Subunit: 309 residues, 6 copies
């Protein structure tokens, strides 16, 4: 979907930029924000057209509090702030954000330049509260050393999982995206053997093969994020996580970003991860990963995004 | 769309070939030309399949006069010859062309080879009247130094803008294309400051950012090529312009090519460019660019092309 | 089109892996085979996702006889074992095969790794009877030195030619695939002149141009594999042939693979090739190429494959 | 030069990592740091070998103070700490750093990974004092929008400019490097016209062509960084500058890094930049750029590095 | 040899530009020309640095008449105008040229931009008399359909063949380059069978294999351009020919360019091609190829080029 | 470094072809072999030149015994047939081979085509006894899942380790190469834990980091293949190992190839591996890998090879 905003279905990229901003309180601030996001195709082409391949994309997400400031009477069915979770030792905090820009390209400069134009257009009307520069790490691995994104649905299944349909016609083609910036305890994770790490995740480390049924822990990342309803129907999300870090501050991170037609699915995966199935049987990845942020956004389709204001 | 003729919606390429031809007067010339263009998928695949990536595309256009020679019975709603324009300072001539081949690939050799095969097959039945070898120039710029193509519609908008639909269902999937070969007066262009050039185009130069509303001159290229109907709906065209030139003949050019499901959109941009809006307030780009050609073609869909 | 099994319509790749297997007569064997192939998206993603470009693909084919062991209640309209041919000079053997894995990627390692994992997951439940490592050879050529695959249908044409439609609705989106592992007599082919070789194939060698109608032998590979029915309508297959070989065993092969919504088209092609049209007037390609295998498979759509 | 430490003459890369560290006071810290930097080819190959292309490079610099702790006996002729400069308007501070790792690759992940391994291995024996992740910006530009590196010497000139030779034969193959992290005042820079910016730099912006002699201001960046001795011989440095930034902290930067067989050349450029030539006639680039750091390191050859 | 002028030894490229110019008669004209060519590293880096790969190169050649206008007292041993040849049916004309720029890059825009800057710097001081935009054609083929450049010497042998040595110390590292723009009669060549074409050339068409000794005509392109002196020592040249053409004017061409430490070798190859060995036994490639130009230039080393003026 | 035979110092490639041949006992056979290998630059250029990047390379090795048939008068100091080994558990067989063709390129087709032409030109004069198609496997790994080739010497180090120097001046620029076609016991290797596998090799698996001195087994592949002499001086080989395999025959191999200025280094390595150091303390890699071949060749410099 060459240089069109709200391309939720783009395949993974070598570079990404995640920007989370909070909008100013004023009416001027609300109008500027609208002007910028509803015309986001402008900066997108202004930057992206300069690369022959046209790899640049930009998905705009809008938070529930900000949505109600600008579209009080028409609201997608499931738009609400991120639901925080507190387990006994691990928590998913709910942190501020009115705007998400999830920007991807084959090159860093393209992501940076678009972020630069976007921030410049907003000026005093919004403030950056989180900024993460994602990068591909070897053969699609995360900093834990496992291939990250394998079972993502693709093509038609990606459309089915991620994009609003007949259930909420007024917002068909939109999505719900959740972000969490995770920081890893690399030391503690390195004290585990590969075989233990594989039990935490649910897949072999180097070869990225799913552990067979009878060796697959009930509390593995894979088991707990498998969602089958009563009718036996599987429910998937579309993820685009990326490595990030700072060697001097000792930050080694995974930026989780996940898209769903109904955030209930993502919310339940999180509930299973943090609170367990059965209760207390939680995701051990969280012994090595601590979420510093948690924000939910509505991803309007292009048509709805262009109308804002 | 891999190796299919009439792929109007292909993205930009590193290389392109623009071939404009006039057909012979004889009934035999007509039949040769029709045999070649109707089976154009042959040469297209014969050359194109040789590249793993399959970047080669070929769009065939037919002029109004030639169309009448081969399909006197049914005509696309808007097919007519290019309309010359005489402005207060500059003019867009209408020049001959029965056939357009708009060829694009990742490599010069594929364009050249497809051109070679096509010309060879047409033999004496046609004559090359204009030929330009277009090339990507740095980060999608033209020789004026500005990023050229930025606001092209893409994907669905591109299809809505360029392809014939329900309004002329007999020729669904076709398009209308207009070409003009422009030559620039480079030294005159260089006497302008960058800011002056920016005001002429409507966008910042290096950074390719549209001037804000209150800094946008009323006669800027962008302003005059903005087409908004009475219901407030914008109407866009799809452009595939490329740089070309010859250093010995001091030729520095932009080959303009624009596709639209209704050429009146393109034509109205041209009128607003050459005559001005309001009249007299014409596009300053034309102070540094002179069109040496001007031709309109109908772009039949594959089905229609294949039956000519 | 990324990392989805049963993607028949994928473009040419630089590397290929063709695996043909026979299943165990057992019931655990039938079950292991079913678990592996119905969840083929697993290993495909497990390998493919490691490559940024996501070039890896995998079409699974099921032989007629093994299909019956696994879905007796329901069967595609035209599934059957490969019809062997015995003609004037040359013969097409019908050889054994229950499972086909047609694997393609931009890299060899991705092909091999996927293969490794499919083989490991089947364990004792199945046996490899034919393994071919296909490779791109220069500008899309076969080892006979001709560009191989040129007139393949593409895009919508390719879908219409290869994919089961309204005529068999329970299996919509599936296909029928025929493989044949050909080996060439290189020294004998090399005693031909280029012009003789062109006569055999139907196209010029370097330039890959189809011979003129008046110069085109009635027994050239091209004429014999051209299918026009009684209404004047053409019928096409989608092929993904690849070179392969071993230098010390002096094997130089074309691994033929072709997909159709209906095997009757491929089978007619094969008849015209081996039997001749008129009879005795057979495909001279067959004088320099000997089919060492011959097998038909049904390619289930992704839905049909996942429930099995 | 594939995967060899101290490859000063590597061409520009898409990505780089600049790590500046201070070592611990203890004798044990000294020994750990020396063990790590002397065996730096280990991590370099451990990461670098994983990329087919082998683009990864790593240049280790050592500060004057730390050098004295480990090789009290022999010193490179010109090793001393960075000299602060106080100009009439702007100043270049001298900031701490015992170790420099200048890491370059085609991919961020290789830089980051090499950095990770190096920091891990140094443990408590050192602290990261500055870290910047540099990146190529369009067609070799810096964030001021100018092509940055144009006149770098290359090949033999590069080796003559950057590498220690007969003048200090004990440290042949070494170099001296100076780093300064500059932050820009982007909005101030943008109040200038393109022509003004061109006069500040000494080159046209889009086209990267040096201003002719009579249009070149006496205080242009290019003019002040031209070093010609009394015999008329120019003395050049080798720069590997990269863009960096943070959009949230409104940081837009150029990380300057310059290698020379004699840092007095670099230092004299700095003096002429910060104090002016004649005094007071300083580099206007410094009106829009502020150096947050300033540090000098000796770059030992592989032999010397390996014996530390 | 990244972005350095006079890089004679560069491997073949996807695009090339050959520019041949004649210098104006005046002293101002001579000085401008000198200023431009002696500072040619300026435009080279100005353009070439913008491509990360640094593929751009520029070799400057100077004709004998122009050399004597500017360096009257120091002259390379073998610098003279191109020696014309007239066979009974085919001739190698000697055509004007004081300056050659042989420019190569991985992209057209880079060649074009450098040519543009070079021509701009010369203004009225010189006139373009020939301009050819070369391009790679498939797998290193020429428009005759044969792989063109196969037997070129490489690495050390390339240096030995192409570059002035101890024989002429004052100009060590310089070269002598000859150009001829050939246009083909494609029709007449297409009337030959592949096997005949192979006999003309000396190599198989598709596979590019040298014809064995006993099937190799005495008048093949390969036989006639094989140069063995009396001592049995082989003498090679370094060629960088490229396809070019214009579909509308029906031009299909090969731009021959060949470098040698002593143009005597190139001259003898030409003499053999045009006049035959034995006499009359000429190169049949010339039945299908007609030279429209013929010019010889001296290629100074970087040091000598920088000194001019 | 382009298209010159006997280029030992070439970096890793995506594809590989290893050909080992035995010569005919005849005199025509000896002569045909000599014509083909002394003019090996012919076919190398014939194939290589077709690829813009010029990645194709070809090292020719001559076995000790065939060398004697062809240049009895003159012999390299350390030429001899492969010394076989019989150790506590595992044995390295000395197998037949007169000619080695070590071929590398960015593409398979280039490898195969070069091979095809070398084989065709030798005809009946020689016979292929071992053919291996090597491939790059993910991030420079072998099929044991470890990064293979990491500590290879590079640039000047690589030249000093691999190329005959002042110590044998008549053969300066030549090398000695040992090949061994290893096959792996995959299921047995997979019963090991990652940490056990790391103990066997000497390096961490995913991260490819060399184990700390205190954690490093005395029988790890790394320690056993580390050569330090009595003066404290290290001696290294240059390896170009590649993966290879066949799925249906369940072969999963590492094709070992190593070059040295002196085979004594490689031979010591092989002794420490098979016999153990102290004796019995052998390379555990050998528990999961079995050498199916074992052959030494002299790699003549280009001069020496061309006169033969
Ligand atoms: C530190 C943060 C995380 C890390 C390192 C991580 C890592 C991984 C890895 C290595 C896999 C296996 C390959 C694959 O993607 O299929 C995986 C799977 C998955 N993860 Fe995460 N993940 C993280 C956070 C999350 C969160 C917060 C969620 C849910 C909101 C989530 C949902 C999933 C899902 C749905 C799968 C696919 C499971 C399946 O059906 O096989 N992940 N993750
Ligand atoms: C000398 C020939 C021309 C040059 C050098 C030129 C250059 C440019 C440039 C630099 C832009 C801004 C970037 C972009 O959005 O593409 C532009 C925009 C545009 N031009 Fe042209 N142009 C030329 C002729 C024409 C002609 C003849 C037409 C109409 C027939 C045309 C129609 C347009 C349109 C529709 C836009 C997009 C306006 C918008 O909606 O923002 N151009 N052109
Ligand atoms: C804010 C930091 C700086 C910026 C943005 C900057 C930018 C530039 C630009 C655009 C050029 C022209 C292109 C080129 O030839 O590279 C240039 C040239 C140059 N700069 Fe800088 N520069 C910076 C700092 C420095 C410093 C600190 C030094 C010396 C220590 C320096 C030394 C040079 C030199 C030697 C040249 C080439 C001059 C010539 O011979 O033409 N620069 N710089
Ligand atoms: C229409 C013009 C020409 C064409 C089409 C042409 C074509 C070819 C071809 C296809 C080859 C075989 C591959 C190879 O390069 O090794 C070749 C070889 C060669 N050509 Fe040309 N050539 C042309 C002009 C010239 C001229 C004018 C000269 C001499 C001044 C020349 C000198 C050579 C040489 C030295 C070889 C290598 C012979 C050997 O040692 O094998 N060529 N040429
Ligand atoms: Cl960024
Ligand atoms: Cl062209
Ligand atoms: Cl494979
Ligand atoms: Cl980094
Ligand atoms: Cl050009
Ligand atoms: Cl091979």
């Amino acid at each position: 979907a060459r240089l069109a905003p709200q391309a939720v279905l783009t395949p993974p990229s070598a570079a990404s930029l995640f920007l989370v901003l909070v909008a100013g309180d004023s009416d001027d601030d609300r109008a500027t924000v609208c002007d910028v996001i509803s015309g986001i195709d402008g900066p997108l082409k202004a930057v992206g057209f300069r690369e022959l391949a046209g790899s640049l994309s930009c998905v705009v997400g809008v938070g529930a509090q900000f949505w109600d400031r600008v579209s009080a009477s028409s609201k997608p069915a499931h738009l609400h702030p991120f639901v925080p979770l507190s387990g006994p030792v691990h928590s998913a905090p709910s942190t501020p954000g009115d705007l998400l820009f999830h920007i991807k390209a084959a090159r860093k400069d393209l992501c940076f330049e678009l972020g630069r134009q976007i921030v410049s257009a907003l000026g005093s009307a919004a403030t950056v509260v989180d900024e993460v520069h994602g990068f591909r790490y070897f053969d699609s691995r995360d900093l834990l050393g496992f291939v990250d994104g394998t079972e993502n649905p693709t093509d038609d299944d990606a459309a089915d999982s991620a994009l609003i349909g007949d259930e909420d016609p007024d917002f068909r083609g939109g999505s719900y995206v959740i972000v969490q910036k995770y920081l890893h305890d690399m030391s503690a994770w390195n004290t585990l053997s590969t075989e233990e790490q594989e039990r935490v995740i649910g897949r072999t480390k180097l070869e990225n093969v799913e552990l067979d049924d009878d060796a697959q822990p009930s509390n593995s990342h894979v088991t707990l994020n498998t969602i089958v309803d009563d009718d036996g129907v599987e429910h998937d999300i579309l993820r685009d996580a990326m490595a990030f870090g700072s060697l001097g501050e000792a930050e080694y991170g995974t930026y989780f970003i996940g898209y769903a037609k109904d955030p209930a699915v993502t919310e339940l995966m999180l509930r299973r991860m943090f609170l367990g199935e059965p209760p207390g049987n939680y995701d051990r990845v969280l012994d090595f990963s601590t979420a510093a942020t948690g924000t939910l956004f509505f991803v309007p389709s292009r048509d709805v995004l262009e109308s804002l204001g």
